């Protein structure tokens, strides 16, 4: 039950942030909606920093780790919105931007996870 | 905030039995445009066809000479909140 509240609180904050950023900013650049991109890149960055940080202090409260990873990062990022965006571009005959969106979301988010991990690891 | 309806719908070339039309895309992901046409005198069937989302022109054929036609274009478009929906139409009248 304590773990459930961590997931719900973190998830609700992440989901809310994604909703606000997506509705506000996605229509600015419809070929690669920047709200959906930013939240995937940010979630990647956060999970990376979490990966490195939680390794250093393994006996810290599981509550904080669960709220941040399953909760926040999990609520914040989305494969579903990413998929329909790409699917719509594919149906629209816009192959160059469908390919670009897949590469920028996937390669970008993996790079952000690496950056988050290595920034904390370098910060000693 | 962003309109999903095309702008500046117009006839760019015409023969007695055909019309080449064009429009400016709305600033959204258009999956396809739907073009409708029928005689303005409201006693004839309206026809529709689609063009891909990358195209912003269309040919309308098999028309009758000297007759007023009502021509509309709307989009089937992707957006965040509404996923796939249809925009309102933009409409013109043109006499062959
Ligand atoms: C997504 C996350 C990315 C990481 C970004 C960095 C954010 C860190 C802010 C909080 O800093 C932590 O505060 C703890 C509480 O003050 C410290 O624990 C210290 O105090 C605890 C007791 O309060 C002990 O259990 C610990 O061993 C002892 O290190 C800990 O060192 C420190 O780092
Ligand atoms: C990323 C965002 C920032 C989040 C930071 C959160 C700050 C609060 C963390 C405090 O967590 C405590 O850490 C202790 C140690 O660090 C643990 O002690 C446990 O582990 C110790 C080390 O093995 C033992 O000495 C203790 O006896 C044992 O109770 C303790 O259970 C745990 O609650
Ligand atoms: C590796 C990732 C795999 C994930 C799976 C992706 C599935 C792809 C679905 C594509 O959907 C089709 O896309 C065509 C191309 O956009 C559309 O054709 C439209 O556009 C064509 C070219 O513009 C025209 O020839 C057609 O008549 C016209 O219907 C067609 O309607 C649409 O159903
Ligand atoms: F996308
Ligand atoms: Na998610």
Residue numbers in the entry:
A (entry chain A): 2 to 125
B (entry chain D): 1 to 96
Excerpt from the publication:
Moreover, the F− coordination shells are completed by conserved phenylalanine residues interacting edge-on with the bound anions, Phe80 associated with the F1− pair and Phe83 with the F2− pair. These four aromatic side chains adopt a striking side-to-face 'Phe-box' arrangement that supports an unusual aromatic-halide coordination motif proposed to be essential for F−-specific binding and permeation. Mutation of the conserved Phe-box residues in a Fluc homologue from B. pertussis was previously shown to severely inhibit F− transport, an effect presumed to reflect the replacement of F−-friendly binding sites in the conduction pathways with kinetic barriers to ion movement. This idea is now tested in Ec2, where we here examine occupancy of the F−-binding sites by solving crystal structures of Phe-box mutants F80I and F83I and assessing their transport function. Substitution of each aromatic side chain by Ile specifically extinguishes the corresponding pair of F− densities, one in each pore, while leaving the other pair Phe-coordinated and unperturbed. The mutations cause only local structural disturbances such as alternate rotamers at nearby sidechains Ser84 and Ser110 (Cα rmsd 0.4 Å, 0.2 Å for F80I, F83I). Functionally, the mutations are dramatic, reducing F− flux in reconstituted liposomes to undetectable levels, a >104-fold rate inhibition compared to the wildtype (WT) channel. Moreover, the F80I / F80I and F83I / F83I double mutants with identical Phe substitutions in both domains - mimics of the mutant homodimers above - are likewise inactive. However, the Phe-mutant crystal structures here, while validating F− coordination by the aromatic rings, refute the idea of a mutually stabilizing quartet, since the two Phe side chains remaining in each Ile substitution, though distant from each other, adopt identical orientations and crystallographic order as in the full Phe-box of WT (side chain rmsd 0.2 Å upon backbone alignment). The results also highlight the importance of the conserved Phe-box residues in crafting coordination spheres for which F− ions are willing to shed their extensive aqueous hydration shells and enter the water-depleted confines of the ion-conduction pathway.
Bacterial Fluc channels assemble as dimers of small subunits (120–130 residues, 4 transmembrane helices) arranged in antiparallel transmembrane topology. The hourglass-shaped channel is complexed with two 'monobody' crystallization chaperones, which plug each of the wide vestibules facing the two aqueous solutions.
